[PDB]
Amino acid sequence: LTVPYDLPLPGGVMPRMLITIMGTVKPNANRIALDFRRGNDVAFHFNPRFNENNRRVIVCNTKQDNNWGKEERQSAFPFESGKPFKIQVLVEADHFKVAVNDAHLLQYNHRMKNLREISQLGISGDITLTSANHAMI
C-alpha cells in the first residue's frame, strides 16, 4: 500500500471496532504516525519516534483547530528498524486500546468523544504497509 495511506472510515468508529495495521518498519526509521482524523482535527495521533534526543518514545495527542494538546508519552517501545509490526487499535467507549505484536501497549482516553465523525485513518512515516483492516469484535 502506498504510504502515506488514508484508510476510509465512512461509518466512523465505535466501541468494539478493532483496527489492524500490518507492515515492516524501514531501515534507519525516524518516525511512524497513525492519525484518526475528524475533518481537519486529529482525534488520536499515535506517533512512535525512533530518535528524539537519542531516545525512543511513543507520543500520543489530539489536534483541535490546528493546535496540539498535551502529549501523552510512553517509553515502552516495541518497534525496531527493518522489522515487521502489527499495530492493533481497539475502540472502547472511554478510550482507544493499542497493542503491538500481540502485546497491549497503551490506552488513550478519548478527548474528542463524537466517534461517528472520525472519518479516516492516516498511516504515515517510515514503513512498508501491507494491510489496514477493521472488524467488530
Ligand SMILES: OC[C@H]1O[C@@H](S[C@@H]2O[C@H](CO)[C@H](O)[C@H](n3cc(-c4cccc(F)c4)nn3)[C@H]2O)[C@H](O)[C@@H](n2cc(-c3cccc(F)c3)nn2)[C@H]1O
Ligand atoms: O504533539 C504531537 C505533535 O508533535 C509535533 S513535534 C512537538 O513540537 C512542539 C513544539 O513546541 C514541542 O517541542 C513538542 N514537545 C516535545 C517534548 C518533549 C518532552 C519530553 C522529552 C522530549 F525529548 C521532548 N515536549 N513537547 C514536540 O513533540 C509534531 O510535529 C506533530 N506531527 C508529527 C507528524 C508526522 C507526519 C508524518 C509522519 C509522521 F510520523 C509524523 N505530523 N505532525 C505531532 O507529532
